[PDB]
């Protein structure tokens, strides 16, 4: 298969290169950690707010064409769940809210900052911290929206058997949603004493 | 006919909004003139204005017999 | 979305104007507004017409809607006005509450400075203006928490007319007080800090204008502890409401 | 300036906090998502044994409390104001990947024998107790990462 | 002059026009006519309110550099 | 050169402008092509359907307009000697309307392509699937939501 | 049109230390790299020095490039030039002058390209 | 003290964040690959044993 | 050389000029090959319908137009000392129009396949065929708009 | 060595020159395959029609001389002393007219296999096949227009 | 500080006591998962014989004792200034459990799956699945023995 030989490909360069370096000497030169030093910190803020959104949309919408399909199917002999079952779309749609407030929240860092603190402690420390945890809201976010989703479409499906199953399987989602909100308590704690950037 | 149902309420508006567009040119309302990029001589615009809106009231008029008949 | 038990508080008459209000809210502009208005007007009047022709339902909907569209506009229309916004431009009713200054050149920066209130809508200084979004974004989201929270809370209360119609004493001391004590304690409060903040004059007192919400942040996850005082005895009564709500 | 407090160690710090939660999220998704396919499933079929057979999903969802903990934790110790040293990072950077992965590998064990334990429960009604057992066994495998999230974030700040 | 006060100037005001109708509400429809006008003027009212606080003691003020001069 | 603006910062603002309308162009694509399809495979035997059907290829082409409208904003705000602050603003501007709006044409194609074969065999079925397609449609709002506050502090204040 | 002032000058013994300064209106000062250039008697213009419009990055002529430092305040519309170990060669009209946007690149400053310049002051030694 | 005088941090920069923006393309268009025709309801067949 | 010149300045023009045309011809390729083979599938049984038919192919075609206006315009703009900010500008045009074009490339090529199908069964839904391919072939539009605006500002006030 | 001429700049030129011909004849073999099954298949029983059935042949050939010239006319610029910039461009013309003669070949070889079965049974087809055919080899004829613009700007004012 | 202890020294320190958990929690949930479906598979049946079919689950458990026997001595050993000799050690430690252990899971994940399934159909069978896992267990406790050998040189004879 073609896409495992390029990933083969790409692994044994990669280690070639790096006993290249070794072996000769010069090993000091790969230097992840001057990397982290150099590159702008806006850089590192900028990719964990559109990828907070971003993801956490990925989330969103994955999660309510598999509820909806389902919805849809599951309707054409009982049309009464179309309107119960709004629910299930509802637990998905608000894990972009989610990333939408926390980009809300992080954008209101996004200052200049002086040329000569450009790479000073603390510019350094929000650069990283809105990264990881952009990243966190995002990523918890798609895995909660997915979560919620297939499970709305278990619910559905359900529903058009017997009413009285579906008050008993909610319980399975809103347990699924809970996943989105811890994601939120723990960006909000990660981007907590981030400053500024001065 | 059908129409000239489109063309006369789409006139209709043509004529109050071009020719109220136009007087706010013709007295250098800050909302149309003020900033350095809007275009310098308001009465210049707004006569060009007044004639698209005799335009579209020859439009209005002449389909209001096509929707009477 | 379904039939209501019987006896039960109708959800009709709230929705009778709650439910294009908070359209307008979202659709403000008063010559969209205008334009909605005409349409739905015009089947509104000619009504015993349509009444008796045959329609397909992607337009019997829009006239069994007819007064729905109607009120769905006139309120779009109020709503545009205090947004001051009709085509994307905006209304030079009032004098402004904001002077610039004496003089500048071509292509100088100004700022505005206060010299009263507008009376109604956003002042139309703020057209063009090159931090409008940062004012309006502020207006808004406040805007929207506070109907929000005004909305839900008075829909709440139709909970409290039910249990004393069916004289269901125990839903009265097992789900309402609870439910109510523990919503308007958090975001009841949130409510209160966000109309109490306009009332302060920071400037004129030389304060440090709080952040509402790090402050809400903090009282859950760092309670009895304060960056900025927005009033007396901040932290003394936020611990009391943490304790009300977790209890 | 220390040597050992670089200004890129807050980075490991972080990238450890995104790790615990991130991969524990995915360990309970897992968990219950399988387990909710089971429960649905025997739906049509014995409606009686739902409430009394969610007990998957209950477990699935403790072990987002196990991240949320160690993303807690580390998240306490980072700070703009202090020298956090590197040998910190590395150890936080532990502490993500140790309770991150060892409840991404016991959601999914939880989620295999869930699924298959309620939706042949419904045959035989004896099997239950034998289900929960094998859970539990499939439970502590996310707290033993915990264990060891705890002592790596004990000794990295001391 | 503006102040808090006049906000709650005109709830008074509102607040006894509508009471003052719930008492002279027509009889026919009177549920109809009781609900929607007193909720209208009340939700009017909060939209006018808060637009109007927002606007008292503003921390931000317009800020602008295409203005021409004479304006 | 400056420490602030480096000769390659505009490459963030070039490739945001044209990721913000790349990517909603391919969710728009996607969502007109799988809608599609299901308004064929239905009105071969029910075409009086058509016109009301068609909804799910109207909301897929509003996602484009989200495209377009930040697309052509952050292109606004372009020049040579930009700084590198604006730069990545104008990336995270793009970016996040751009992968918004992806994943929201694709639910959209999903979704309608369910929906317009339900509409087909059960008439009640339409309402539903309208209500459902709107909370596909609002995921690409929100990208460009925040694409409007990031690029609203393109220019603030940022010195060279 | 655009105006500036410069300030400071007189005659000064070898060894001084005078500090020119320069105010400015009529434009966004923050927007525009600034510049000073000097003409002793009877030669042509000389480029002294440039800053950026954040005042983070400068460039000094040889003649100068340790003696002279030029500073920039964005919110005072204002531009100084400190110098030190002043001597006769120094003796010239200075003049305060408006240049490119943002800041000068190579090709620029060699051009000698500027918009608008005041009516200098003098400087003898 | 630079980070490489060929591999510079700006040009990193611009690889990482173009990587990025071509993944997001790769799973765009490894999704749109998949979109098959509903072939048989497009086409009527017939035989004479129904109906 | 001149840090806002670098030799390497016109590599980006020149992969930008050939982006242009080299992606929108993929995407008209799929749409006149896809559609082609619903056209003679269904004008073996209906040939008098075959003049009617071909819509799609035009469609498909004119997308391949839209890359070659803007890949002629940037080309015009090259030169051996062009800014690296040009560079930028026509790299990001040509990535609009191109990657755009394809997007549009696919829908056109699948509606057009499925909807000259389905008009050989009913002919009702031709008119709705074309409705939807409008849609589609929009989705190009915008790729050039964001293309011309951002070739546009490609030279003004640049400084090389 | 020259700042504007790196002693490497002549591989841009050599990878351009082959490109352009390694490309086109891909495109150009897989159109003459896929439609020489077709033209094998779709005569056994109707051989009458054999050589008015080769024309997708013919014209999947054609597009291999647009390589062809494009080819040769770079083969002529090179020189060991060439400008950087004037490797780009001839890096630029051998893409533009090698990837989207690659396009219009597979478009041609899916047509034509599709249009050669049905114009066996259905003689009114041809003509369809002929003018669809047309669009698509037109695909190619973009590409070398594109190359041959560059061509001209390669080296008409550049200097070492 | 000393070039035999780089500060970067802990980090593959760290990384082999990760290494120790998350392989051995795979080895020891895969063989949890596939033996739990044999066991619920089976006692639909017999569901007299649970409690004694259920040993491999148990066997499986066990591997994820010595990942965390392994993992709590390395963390133990661990310190701001450790010689980097002392990490190599560490991740190999970490690395022979681990791995080690990842093998030991898939073996009683295949061997019970099957044994337990056996089993219900002939009780004699049972001793012989128990002699299987044993041989399968050992693997384990092979790379557990490797790895307290590498843990205790980790500091024998160091200096910083």
């Known amino acids: 298969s073609f896409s495992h030989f390029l990933y083969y490909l790409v692994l044994i360069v990669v280690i070639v290169y790096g006993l290249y370096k070794l072996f000769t000497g010069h090993g000091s030169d790969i230097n992840f950690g001057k990397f982290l030093l150099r590159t702008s910190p806006y850089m590192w803020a900028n990719l964990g707010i559109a990828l907070c959104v971003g993801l956490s949309v990925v989330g969103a919408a994955w999660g309510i064409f598999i509820t909806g399909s389902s919805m849809i199917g599951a309707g054409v002999r009982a049309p009464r769940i179309t309107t119960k079952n709004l629910i299930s779309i509802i637990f998905c749609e608000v894990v972009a809210i989610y990333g939408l407030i926390i980009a809300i929240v992080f954008s209101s860092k996004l200052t200049v900052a002086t040329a000569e603190n450009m790479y000073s402690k603390s510019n350094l420390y929000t650069g990283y911290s809105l990264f990881w945890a952009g990243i966190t809201v995002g990523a918890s976010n798609l895995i909660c929206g997915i979560a919620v989703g297939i499970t709305g479409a278990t619910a559905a499906i359900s529903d058009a058997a017997d009413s009285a199953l579906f008050v008993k399987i909610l319980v399975i989602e809103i347990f699924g949603s809970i996943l989105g909100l811890l994601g939120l308590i723990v960006g909000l704690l990660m981007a907590g004493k981030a400053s500024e950037f001065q | 006919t059908g129409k000239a149902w489109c063309c006369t309420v789409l006139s209709a508006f043509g004529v109050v909004i071009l020719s109220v567009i136009a007087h706010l040119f013709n007295t250098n309302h800050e909302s149309f003139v003020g900033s350095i990029n809007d275009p310098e001589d308001g009465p210049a615009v707004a006569h060009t204005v007044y004639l698209a809106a005799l335009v579209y009231l020859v439009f209005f008029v002449f389909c209001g017999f096509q929707v009477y008949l | 979305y379904g039939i209501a038990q019987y006896r039960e508080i109708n959800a009709g008459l709230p929705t009778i104007v709650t439910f294009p209000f908070m359209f307008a809210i979202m659709f403000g502009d008063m010559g969209h507004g205008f334009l909605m208005t005409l349409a739905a007007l015009s089947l509104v009047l000619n009504e015993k017409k349509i009444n008796k022709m045959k329609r397909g339902e992607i337009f019997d909907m829009a006239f069994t809607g007819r007064y729905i569209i109607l009120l769905m506009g006139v309120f779009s229309m109020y709503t545009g006005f205090l947004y001051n916004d009709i085509f994307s431009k905006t209304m030079t009713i009032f004098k402004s509450g904001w002077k610039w200054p004496d003089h500048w050149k071509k292509g100088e920066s100004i700022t505005a400075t206060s010299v009263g209130t507008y009376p109604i809508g956003l002042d139309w200084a703020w057209h063009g203006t090159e931090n409008a979004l940062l004012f309006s974004n502020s207006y808004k989201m406040k805007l929207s928490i506070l109907m929000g929270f005004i909305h839900m809370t008075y829909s709440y209360f139709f909970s409290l007319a039910n249990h004393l119609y069916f004289n269901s004493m125990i839903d009265i001391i097992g789900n309402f007080i609870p439910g109510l004590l523990f919503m308007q304690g958090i975001f009841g409060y949130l409510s209160v800090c966000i109309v109490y903040k306009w009332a302060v004059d920071w400037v004129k007192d030389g304060k440090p204008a709080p952040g509402l919400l790090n402050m809400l942040i903090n009282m859950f996850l760092s309670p009895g502890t304060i960056d900025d005082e927005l009033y007396p005895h901040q932290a003394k009564v936020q611990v009391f409401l943490l304790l009300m709500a977790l209890v | 300036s220390n040597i050992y407090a670089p200004l890129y160690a807050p980075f490991f710090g972080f990238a450890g906090c995104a790790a615990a939660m991130v991969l524990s999220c995915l360990g309970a998704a897992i968990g219950t998502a399988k387990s909710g396919i089971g429960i649905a499933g025997i739906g049509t079929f014995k409606p009686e044994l739902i409430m009394k057979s969610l007990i998957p999903v209950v477990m699935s969802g403790i072990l987002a409390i196990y991240g949320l903990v160690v993303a807690v934790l580390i998240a306490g110790n980072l700070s703009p104001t202090e020298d956090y040293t590197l040998f910190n990072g590395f150890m936080h950077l532990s502490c993500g990947l140790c309770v991150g992965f060892a409840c991404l590998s016991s959601g999914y064990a939880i989620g295999m024998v869930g699924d298959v334990g309620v939706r042949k429960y419904m045959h035989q009604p004896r099997l239950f107790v034998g289900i929960v057992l094998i859970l539990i066994f499939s439970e502590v495998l996310g707290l033993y990462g915990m264990i060891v999230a705890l002592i790596l974030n004990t000794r990295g700040s001391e | 002059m503006s102040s808090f006060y006049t906000v709650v100037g005109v709830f008074i005001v509102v607040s006894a026009m509508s009471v003052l109708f719930w008492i002279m509400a027509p009889k026919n429809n009177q549920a109809v006519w009781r609900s929607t006008v007193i909720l209208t003027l009340a939700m009017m009212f909060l939209m006018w309110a808060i637009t109007f606080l927002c606007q008292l003691h503003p921390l931000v003020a317009p800020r602008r550099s295409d203005l021409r001069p004479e304006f | 050169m400056t420490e602030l603006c480096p000769v390659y910062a505009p490459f963030f603002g070039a490739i945001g402008c044209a990721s913000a309308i790349i990517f909603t162009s391919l969710g728009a694509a996607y969502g007109t092509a799988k809608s599609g399809v299901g308004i064929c495979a239905t009105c071969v035997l029910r075409p009086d359907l058509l016109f009301k059907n068609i909804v799910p290829v109207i909301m897929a082409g509003i996602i484009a307009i989200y495209g377009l409208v930040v697309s052509v904003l952050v292109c606004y705000s372009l020049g040579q000697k930009q700084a590198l602050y604006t730069g990545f603003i104008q990336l995270g501007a793009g970016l996040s309307v751009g992968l918004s709006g992806l994943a929201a044409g694709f639910a959209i194609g999903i979704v309608g392509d369910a929906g317009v074969r339900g509409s087909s065999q059960q008439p009640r079925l339409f309402v539903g699937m309208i209500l459902i397609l709107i909370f596909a449609e609002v995921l690409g709002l929100y990208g460009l939501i925040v694409a409007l506050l990031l690029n609203s502090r393109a220019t603030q204040d940022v010195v060279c | 049109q655009v105006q500036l002032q410069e300030s400071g000058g007189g005659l000064v013994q070898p060894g001084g230390s005078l500090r020119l300064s320069c105010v400015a209106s009529?434009?966004?000062?923050?927007?525009?790299?600034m510049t000073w250039v000097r003409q002793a008697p009877g030669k042509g213009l000389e480029w002294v020095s440039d800053?950026?419009?954040?005042?983070?990055?400068?460039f000094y002529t040889d003649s100068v490039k340790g003696r002279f430092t030029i500073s920039r305040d964005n919110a005072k519309n204002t531009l100084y030039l400190q110098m030190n170990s002043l001597k006769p060669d120094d003796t010239a009209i200075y003049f305060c002058?408006?240049?490119?946007?943002?800041?000068?690149?190579?090709?620029?400053?060699?051009?000698?390209?500027?918009?608008?310049r005041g009516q200098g002051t003098q400087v003898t030694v | 003290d630079i980070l490489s005088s060929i591999w510079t941090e700006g040009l990193l920069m611009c690889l990482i964040v173009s990587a990025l923006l071509l993944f997001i393309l790769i799973v765009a268009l490894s999704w749109i690959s998949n979109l098959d025709i509903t072939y048989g309801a497009l086409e009527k067949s017939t035989n004479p044993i129904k109906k | 050389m001149t840090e806002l010149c670098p030799v390497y300045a016109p590599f980006f023009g020149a992969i930008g000029c050939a982006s242009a045309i080299i992606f929108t011809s993929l995407g008209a390729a799929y749409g006149t090959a896809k559609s082609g083979v619903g056209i003679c599938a269904t004008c073996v049984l209906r040939p008098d319908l075959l003049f009617k038919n071909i819509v799609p192919v035009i469609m498909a075609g004119i997308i391949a137009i839209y890359g070659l206006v803007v890949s002629v315009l940037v080309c015009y703009s090259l030169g051996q000392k062009q800014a690296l900010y040009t560079g930028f500008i026509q790299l990001g045009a040509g990535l609009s129009v191109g990657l755009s074009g394809l997007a549009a490339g696919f829908a056109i090529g699948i509606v057009g396949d499925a909807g000259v199908r389905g008009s050989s069964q009913q002919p009702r839904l031709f008119v709705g065929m074309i409705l939807i391919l409008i849609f589609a072939e929009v989705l190009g539009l915008y790729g050039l708009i964001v293309a011309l605006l951002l070739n546009s500002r490609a030279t003004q006030d640049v400084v090389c | 060595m020259t700042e504007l001429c790196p002693v490497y700049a002549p591989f841009f030129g050599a990878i351009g020159c082959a490109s352009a011909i390694i490309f086109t004849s891909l495109g150009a073999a897989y159109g003459t395959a896929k439609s020489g099954v077709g033209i094998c298949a779709t005569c056994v029983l109707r051989p009458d029609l054999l050589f008015k059935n080769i024309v997708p042949v013919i014209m999947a050939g054609i597009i291999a001389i647009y390589g062809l010239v494009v080819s040769v006319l770079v083969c002529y610029s090179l020189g060991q002393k060439q400008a950087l910039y004037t490797g780009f461009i001839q890096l630029g013309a051998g893409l533009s007219v090698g990837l989207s003669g690659l396009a219009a070949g597979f478009a041609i070889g899916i047509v034509g296999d599709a249009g050669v079965r049905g114009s066996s049974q259905q003689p009114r087809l041809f003509v369809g096949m002929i003018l669809i055919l047309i669009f698509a080899e037109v695909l190619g004829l973009y590409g070398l227009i594109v190359a041959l613009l560059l061509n001209s700007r390669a080296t008409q004012d550049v200097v070492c | 500080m000393t070039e035999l202890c780089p500060v970067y020294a802990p980090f593959f320190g760290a990384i082999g006591c990760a290494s120790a958990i998350i392989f051995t929690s795979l080895g020891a949930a895969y063989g949890t998962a596939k033996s739990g479906v044999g066991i619920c598979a089976t006692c639909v049946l017999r569901p007299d014989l649970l409690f004694k079919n259920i040993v491999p689950v148990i066997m499986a458990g066990i591997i994820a004792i010595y990942g965390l026997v392994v993992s709590v001595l390395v963390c133990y050993s661990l310190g701001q200034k450790q010689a980097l000799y002392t990490g190599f050690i560490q991740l190999g430690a970490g690395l022979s459990v681990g791995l080690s252990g990842l093998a030991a899971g898939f073996a009683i994940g295949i061997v019970g799956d099957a044994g337990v399934r056996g089993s219900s159909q002939q009780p004699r069978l049972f001793v012989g699945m128990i002699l299987i896992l044993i041989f399968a267990e050992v693997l384990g406790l092979y790379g557990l023995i490797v790895a307290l050998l590498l843990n205790s040189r980790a500091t024998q004879d160091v200096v910083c």
């Open positions: 002058a408006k240049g490119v946007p943002s800041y000068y690149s190579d090709y620029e400053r060699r051009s000698k390209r500027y918009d608008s």
């Open positions: 009529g434009f966004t000062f923050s927007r525009y790299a």
């Open positions: 800053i950026s419009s954040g005042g983070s990055s400068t």
